């Protein structure tokens, strides 16, 4: 119990667990806009895509990718 | 020979905590030393794991302490152990020094041990004061102000000494930052002085509650005093667990949860509970310079103790009047603490002066006179002529 | 000092969270938050209590979220450096009614209303002091006391003259659960809520105290047994002495 | 007692017995003390309040 | 007897720095130990007097370092002494360990001394890394990130270990605060390990540059090696004063004066100059887990050293091939540092792999084979049959 | 990397403050501050340089006071909590032209102009790099380099493509002392001024270095004498050995 106390006192505190999540609005970001945010100490790129960009995404052949992966 | 005797590192562990010849008649009052060692380890380990979350700016000290007590997992355990364990550290140290005065452990050949003990006591008072100022509450700020103005009482030099201590013109951001650095530093000096203390002890061995030699019937350290110290370790942890978990803020002062405000003075500025006899000694003198000199002389008068005990038997065990006046002294020290906790009011000034006089009279007049009378009484009780 | 400067001694009210086993009354904490928000929060900040600490203690998740989204905080600025606001979330703190100290002293006749995050732990007496402070205003001060104008009397404040108004009257708030909201009921509820705000660890502190006191009492009795065991060869040891032949 | 020294003779199986005993004791003591501490405070916890709120 | 021999405290001062029997043939390479002690005292005293002005928040670290270099009186002296003295501390420690490898001080009966030396070396690398991350520049932030992701390579556990180290999800305010607390703490552990090092030395005395016994012609410590160490102390302070006052920012990396930005990665992330061989060893392995294991094995392969030196004479003084391959090893270590300072480019990857292989081959293949051949060559050179 | 990503190597210009005895040219620091204020300060903060450091270094007391009183800083609020401004004083810092990072990136096509308090100490090459950066823009980039639009070329920047404009032209400022203010003159002046801003201790550092190197060299030679002195009984010691009588 003493080892639990003195080691778990060095873990992530309450307030740094409070800011672990961001809750960005889908209705507030426009279509042709990119949003760059600092979340979890890291950059995050956010984009509203068009269906033609979806068709461009899922129709490129996998041999043009060194790590192939489908869009879904 | 054995591996615990032939190895360089394990020979110290052997000759200190395994095969150390202890006198076989020592009671539980010879256990406060191990208890102080355990409580020092508690203070250091909680200090490290709590100083990983502490920011020592003057605008961010109190908020970081509350960040420890609120956001850090089990941080209330750390702070409550730390403050209440400092209170128990001074209580066990007061009991240890009372064991020293009672059984005559200050006498020859243990004067070096007593002097290193007084040095440890001064360094521990310094550590507790610096760490109490690191909280930066109301009592922390104003206690730092009063103690450093007491250092300004020194003639022709003192104001520049105090501007050196403050790092400015009042208790400000450099003062709290250097108090945190010094407060992190001085416990390792206390650990080094404890090792020197153990060396000066080990060159002659412990005393015994009879005041005669103990070279005849020695029993080892291992399993005997190991399990006796384990008994008092578990009792100490039990009482510490009570005052941490069920009533943590009893020993502290509630004004210390007000943030540090340099403009508002409190209604009653009082240190934490154990510095109150020394604060009463200093407050009883109607002068600043003589007050500071008397406050430091109230610790150096423990150094003048082995040269005034003129009793030819060691310790107050088999002496009547010395035992009675010892308990007069102990309850006088408690009365000094309770005078210091009060205001500067009639008749507490006159009682503080009388109590300071009985403190210094015990250390300078009562002990040599009563020891001389007790020596002559022991002689003429059994010698017939 | 006299008893007037020291203030009258708050008595021993039998709270539902005294004793080494009783916890907080969380329904009373919920009602204390309601009385806080509708009475105190016009003039008292609560700067050290985040919104996330109320989730699972006095309110649910959506209740705390829909109470925090009524307030506006400082967002990071937009792509032109203009300062913008945002609605609150769970990670923010409970905002004060006053933007700085000088607005507080302007709106309260010079007196600064203290932040109530630690006010039951920063007064002697504590819970009893806060309750007796709220329910202690006489209808008129005792004969011979000249109050400075703009200040009020109750004997529990140190000095007698306080700059607070009597702000607990009969049924000024309505409770959600239908409890009769008299003055003493609301004062008991806010004092329990402020005890929660100063000591959010109180419940877990007492149960870990129960575990630690049980384990250490058992260890202390077991260690007494093992000390009496391993010293049994030394307590019962006996010495006889026949004095040796003196010729040697 | 009896003649069983397969628990006390060898220090390996003895300290393994002490560790297995503490491993069971942590779980059992924690669950029992949480159940008692919630039984003693029936009506005050947030579980009871959330069950009371419709 | 004399007072320096009969006193409890002065007997240690006597038996260590006054009447310690030293071999009378030791040259200036047996002076790096006293020089490391002086440089450790320099590091600690500048660390205290510079940590009285340091605030360890992530938003206030770099600003407080610049507050030290600008507003604090003589603060540029403190920081420049501190950083350049850490560089000299590792340079004198590298020369001290090279003295250990060359003259065979690792061999029996001094294996305990060598192992405590390797423990001191690991703790000193840890202290320097933590204090370099306390600056929170560009290199500080990104070096902390890379080293802790290297700790994330550990299978099935490592991600939670790294979230424990960070105190969050990336290098943030709790990371810098706990790095400052640990960085204040670990030098006192280094001081305790130094005292244990001196004990393990003192139970057999120093070696000599011939590899024969020195029990025949001993001269005392006092005045002889006191003034010889005083010579190298003044030379060390002279060179430190040059690199502090005339060219302070030479050994450092100029990117460390950019504030810590988690978004911008630098063009070349490089540690401070002395960790570069170990960084090259780790970068030469094409795997994260094997890279971390190889980086720690590059220090534990110093522990496997006394069991592979099969030479029957102590030290490389009177042996040809061992001396030649020793200087092969030393210039290989310099080449590791210079490979690590470069980019991951052709042909530095292949040269880093060959240089790591020659490092481990010197510690595991070259020393036993060359020592066996040198033994047989010494035998058949003088024995006729 | 190629030489293009690494950037061209800035050469060794013979500054008036290289060498272990030469100090700064304080007239050049004064003129460098003038070129800073009239060219750089539209787009570069100087956040770590207080006003009081210029008193007695590059300007007098009243000059720094009348340059600081042209700017507005945040005063403590009034008796109603309203935020108010005040003119500057000696204890404040040199303010940046941009209130936050996003206004900087908005006004400079996304690129953030770095704070120039430590920019000569945070680049390899230092003074030579800053001078070659300012005076290194070609009239047109070399053939085959497709610049991204809105960016500029000079070979000294790592990568070749910089987002700065060429902002040192012939005689855009006037000097107080009548020095001909060409591009290279202004670049030399601002590079000396930025060397002062990164290293304000430079003068006192070199004179205390002179004192310390003299005293430690004298101590080192004196200690060599005392070591050769106290070892003279041991260097010259001699041993003869007549082998003993073998009967014993
Ligand atoms: C305040 C916060 C301090 C925190 C420190 C925690 C440790 C507290 C230490 C207190 C202390 O050390 O006093 C020791 C005092 C003298 O001891 P002695 O050797 O003369 O008695 C031999 C015993 O019968 C041997 O009996 P035995 O050795 O077999 O068991 C002793 C006892 C253990 O108890 C203690 O250690 C002190 C409570 O086991 C029990 O049976 C306990 C039953 C529940 O014990 C006594 O006998 C009491 C005499 C009066 C002392 C009053 C103290 C007021 C300050
Ligand atoms: C610091 C505090 C850490 C506390 C961790 C406690 C871990 C378990 C300790 C208790 C334990 O299992 O002790 C068993 C051994 C032997 O204890 P013993 O019973 O005195 O030895 C007799 C051995 N027989 C003859 C029975 C085979 O005892 C040991 O091996 C000694 C371990 C002592 C650890 C301190
Ligand atoms: C980092 C190492 C550290 C060590 C070692 C340490 N402390 Fe402390 N101590 C602190 C910190 C940090 C604080 C302030 C935070 C707090 O008070 O909770 C503190 C605060 C205190 C306080 C005030 C507690 C309060 O909240 O009122 C006291 C009293 C104290 N220390 C006494 C001691 C004594 C006595 C020792 C050892 C002989 C000691 N400390 C050793 C870190 C340490
Ligand atoms: C407080 C006690 C303290 C001790 C003891 C200490 N340091 Fe430091 N050290 C610091 C502080 C504070 C900093 C950060 C401020 C700075 O870098 O100037 C630092 C920074 C450093 C740096 C980075 C310097 C820079 O600016 O890049 C190094 C390297 C370093 N320490 C090495 C050591 C070594 C090696 C030791 C001892 C073996 C040591 N330190 C002991 C306080 C200490
Ligand atoms: C001012 C007096 C004094 C102080 C304070 C003091 N000591 Fe002692 N200590 C002594 C004396 C005297 C003895 C020996 C008394 C005897 O054996 O009769 C002693 C003995 C000891 C012993 C041996 C066991 C024992 O009880 O005799 C230990 C262990 C010890 N001290 C540790 C400490 C530690 C740890 C501290 C605090 C860091 C400390 N001491 C503070 C005077 C002191
Ligand atoms: C009229 C505005 C006002 C309202 C509404 C108000 N307060 Fe106060 N309160 C004050 C002021 C002003 C003070 C400062 C009193 C002083 O400094 O003398 C104060 C002080 C206090 C204090 C500290 C008193 C002391 O002597 O330390 C407490 C406790 C307190 N209020 C509780 C409450 C509670 C609970 C509520 C909600 C029911 C509340 N107050 C609502 C104005 C208000
Ligand atoms: C891992 C290697 C190693 C490290 C690291 C090391 N030591 Fe040593 N040290 C030795 C060896 C080996 C000797 C014995 C010299 C010999 O072979 O006779 C030694 C001897 C010494 C001596 C005696 C004087 C001398 O030159 O031999 C001192 C003093 C000393 N060490 C101090 C230190 C200090 C201080 C540190 C760092 C704080 C340190 N050592 C780190 C291996 C090391
Ligand atoms: C046109 C606006 C503008 C003006 C005017 C301006 N700067 Fe810049 N400066 C910038 C931008 C933008 C950057 C950073 C561009 C980048 O990183 O690509 C910059 C970067 C710099 C850099 C460092 C560039 C690097 O790569 O590290 C220095 C040095 C510099 N400026 C000095 C000056 C000086 C001196 C002046 C005045 C004499 C000045 N600048 C005036 C916009 C400006
Ligand atoms: C083999 O022959 C030997 C040999 O036997 C020995 C012993 C040595 C000598 C070894 C040493 C000198 C190394 C000893 C090193 C230590 C013991 C490390 C201890 C270091 C410290 C820094 C001690 C810690 C002290 C402090 C932290 C105090 C500092 C406090 C300050 C500055 C407080 C300031 C605050 C205020 C308010 C003034 C040799 O050099 C040697 O070769 C000739
Ligand atoms: C007279 O006979 C004796 C006797 O001789 C002795 C020695 C003792 C024992 C007395 C003592 C042991 C007291 C001495 C105390 C010390 C020397 C204090 C030592 C404590 C420290 C140096 C601090 C502890 C430091 C650590 C444990 C370092 C590890 C801490 C941390 C925070 C590292 C964690 C970091 C990570 C990343 C996990 C007696 O009790 C006794 O009477 C029976
Ligand atoms: C540095 C910190 C100083 C703190 C002072 C602590 C003084 C008492 C230390 C007690 C150590 C007990 C070891 C006894 C032992 O090994 O005997 C061993 C075996 O005994 C045991 O197994 C004891 C059972 C386990 C007890 C574990 C107690 C841990 C709680 C310690 C709490 C304080 C840290 C030798 O016993 P034997 O010679 O009679 O055969
Ligand atoms: C706070 C301490 C202050 C200073 C006081 C010093 C007291 C230190 C007490 C330490 C007690 C525990 C130490 C146990 C180590 C015993 C192991 C041992 O001696 O084996 C040693 C080898 O030691 C090592 O390699 C590593 C020792 C590192 C120790 C770091 C803690 C065996 O060596 P041996 O004695 O048999 O000599 C034969 C020569 N070939
Ligand atoms: C982890 C270890 C850390 C380092 C500790 C070991 C190294 C300690 C070296 C200490 C060197 C300085 C100590 C010299 C002091 C000698 C005075 C003395 O011993 O006289 C002592 C008295 O000492 C004192 O009162 C207080 C000494 C506290 C020391 C505080 C530093 C008298 O000793 P003695 O009994 O031999 O005298 C008989 C009279 N003819
Ligand atoms: C506490 C350990 C500090 C050891 C520092 C050794 C590093 C050498 C650089 C010292 C420069 C810092 C001092 C300085 O700036 O002075 C400068 C003068 O240079 C010197 O005299 C340094 C000579 C060093 C002699 C060392 C004597 C040993 C004393 C042991 C401690 C009592 C500035 O002088 P000033 O402020 O004008 O009086």
Automatic annotation (TrEMBL), chains B, E:
Heme b b566 binds at residues 96, 197. It is found in: Mitochondrion inner membrane. Residues 1-210 form the Cytochrome b/b6 N-terminal region profile domain. Coiled coil: none annotated. Its main location: mitochondrion. PANTHER family: CYTOCHROME B. Component of the ubiquinol-cytochrome c reductase complex (complex III or cytochrome b-c1 complex) that is part of the mitochondrial respiratory chain. The b-c1 complex mediates electron transfer from ubiquinol to cytochrome c. Contributes to the generation of a proton gradient across the mitochondrial membrane that is then used for ATP synthesis. This is Cytochrome b. It comes from Saccharomyces cerevisiae (Baker's yeast). The gene is CYTB.
Automatic annotation (TrEMBL), chains C, F:
Binds 1 heme c group covalently per subunit. Belongs to the cytochrome c family. This is quinol--cytochrome-c reductase. Its EC number is 7.1.1.8. Its main location: mitochondrion. It catalyses: a quinol + 2 Fe(III)-[cytochrome c](out) = a quinone + 2 Fe(II)-[cytochrome c](out) + 2 H(+)(out). Residues 27-180 form the Cytochrome c domain. Heme c binds at residues 40, 43-44, 164. GO terms for biological process: mitochondrial electron transport, ubiquinol to cytochrome c. Keywords: Electron transport, Heme, Iron, Membrane, Metal-binding, Mitochondrion, Mitochondrion inner membrane, Respiratory chain, Translocase, Transmembrane, Transmembrane helix, Transport. The keyword Zinc does not apply. It comes from Saccharomyces cerevisiae (Baker's yeast). The chain holds residues 62 to 309 of 309 of the full protein. GO terms for cellular component: mitochondrial inner membrane. Signal peptide: none annotated. It comes from the Eukaryota. Residues 70-79 have a biased composition (Acidic residues). GO terms for molecular function: heme binding; metal ion binding; quinol-cytochrome-c reductase activity. Residues 70-107 are annotated as: Disordered. It is found in: Mitochondrion inner membrane. Its cofactor is heme c. The keyword Transmembrane helix applies. Transmembrane segments: none annotated.
């Amino acid at each position: 119990s003493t080892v639990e106390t003195f080691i778990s006192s060095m873990t992530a505190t309450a307030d740094v667990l409070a800011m672990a999540k961001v809750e960005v609005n889908l209705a507030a970001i426009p279509l042709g806009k990119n949003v760059v945010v600092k979340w979890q100490g890291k950059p995050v790129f956010i984009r509203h895509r068009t269906p033609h960009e979806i068709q461009e995404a899922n129709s490129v052949d996998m041999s043009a990718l060194k790590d192939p992966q489908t869009d879904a | 020979m054995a591996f615990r005797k032939s190895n360089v590192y394990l020979s110290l562990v052997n000759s200190y905590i395994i095969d150390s010849p202890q006198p076989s008649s020592i009671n539980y009052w010879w256990n406060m030393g191990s208890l102080l060692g355990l409580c020092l380890v508690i203070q250091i380990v909680t200090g490290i794991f709590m100083a990983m979350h502490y920011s020592s700016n003057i605008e961010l000290a109190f908020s970081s302490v509350e960040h420890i007590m609120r956001d850090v997992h089990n941080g209330y355990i750390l702070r409550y152990l730390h403050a209440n364990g400092a209170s128990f550290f001074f209580m066990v140290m007061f009991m240890h020094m009372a064991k020293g005065l009672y059984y005559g452990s200050y006498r020859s050949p243990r004067v070096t041990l007593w002097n290193v003990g007084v040095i440890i006591f001064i360094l521990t008072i310094a550590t507790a004061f610096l760490g109490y100022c690191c909280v930066y509450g109301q009592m922390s700020h104003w206690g730092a102000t009063v103690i450093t103005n007491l250092f300004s009482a020194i003639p022709f030099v003192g104001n520049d000494i105090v501007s050196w201590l403050w790092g400015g013109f009042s208790v400000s951001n450099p003062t709290i930052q250097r108090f945190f650095a010094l407060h992190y530093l001085v416990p390792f000096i206390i650990a080094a002085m404890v090792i020197m203390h153990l060396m000066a002890l080990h060159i002659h061995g412990s005393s015994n509650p009879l005041g005669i030699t103990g070279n005849l019937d020695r029993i080892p350290m291992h399993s005997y005093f190991i399990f006796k110290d384990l008994v008092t370790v578990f009792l100490f942890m039990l009482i510490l667990a009570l005052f941490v978990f069920y009533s943590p803020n009893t020993l502290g002062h509630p004004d210390n949860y007000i943030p540090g405000n340099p403009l508002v003075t409190p209604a009653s500025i009082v240190p934490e509970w154990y510095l109150l006899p020394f604060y009463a000694i200093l407050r009883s003198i109607p002068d600043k310079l003589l007050g500071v000199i008397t406050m430091f002389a109230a610790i150096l008068v423990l150094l003048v103790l082995p040269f005034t005990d003129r009793s030819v038997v060691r310790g107050n065990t088999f002496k009547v009047l010395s035992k009675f006046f010892f308990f007069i002294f102990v309850f006088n020290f408690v009365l000094l603490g309770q005078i210091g906790a009060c205001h500067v009011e009639v008749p507490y000034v006159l009682m503080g002066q009388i109590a300071t006089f009985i403190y210094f009279a015990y250390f300078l007049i009562i002990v040599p006179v009563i020891s001389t009378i007790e020596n002559v009484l022991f002689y003429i009780g059994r010698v017939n002529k | 000092m006299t008893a007037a400067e020291h203030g009258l001694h708050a008595p021993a009210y039998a709270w539902s969270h005294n004793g080494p086993f009783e916890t907080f009354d969380h329904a009373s904490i919920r009602r204390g938050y309601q009385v806080y928000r509708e009475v105190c929060a016009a003039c008292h900040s609560l700067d050290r209590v985040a919104w996330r600490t109320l989730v699972g203690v006095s309110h649910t998740n959506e209740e705390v979220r829909n109470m925090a989204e009524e307030f506006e905080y400082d967002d990071e600025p937009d792509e032109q450096g203009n300062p913008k606001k945002r609605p609150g979330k769970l990670s923010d703190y409970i905002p004060g009614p006053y933007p700085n100290e000088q607005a507080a002293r302007a709106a309260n006749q010079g007196a600064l209303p203290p932040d109530l995050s630690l006010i039951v732990k920063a007064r002697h007496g504590g819970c009893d002091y806060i309750f007796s402070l709220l329910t202690g205003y006489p209808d008129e001060p005792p004969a011979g006391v000249a109050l400075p104008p703009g200040s009020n009397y109750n004997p529990y404040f140190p000095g007698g003259s306080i700059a607070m108004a009597r702000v607990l009257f009969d049924d000024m708030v309505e409770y959600e659960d239908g409890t009769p909201a008299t003055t003493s009921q609301m004062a008991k509820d806010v004092t329990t809520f402020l005890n929660w705000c100063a000591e959010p660890e109180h419940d877990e502190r007492k149960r870990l105290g129960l575990k630690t006191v049980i384990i250490l009492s058992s260890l202390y009795l077991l260690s007494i047994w093992v000390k009496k065991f391993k010293w049994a060869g030394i307590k019962t040891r006996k010495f006889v002495f026949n004095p040796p032949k003196p010729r040697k | 007692s009896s003649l069983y020294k397969t628990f006390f003779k060898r220090n390996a199986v003895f300290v393994g017995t002490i560790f297995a005993g503490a491993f069971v004791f942590q779980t059992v003591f924690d669950t029992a003390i949480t159940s008692w501490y919630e039984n003693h405070n029936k009506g005050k916890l947030w579980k009871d309040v959330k069950a009371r709120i419709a």
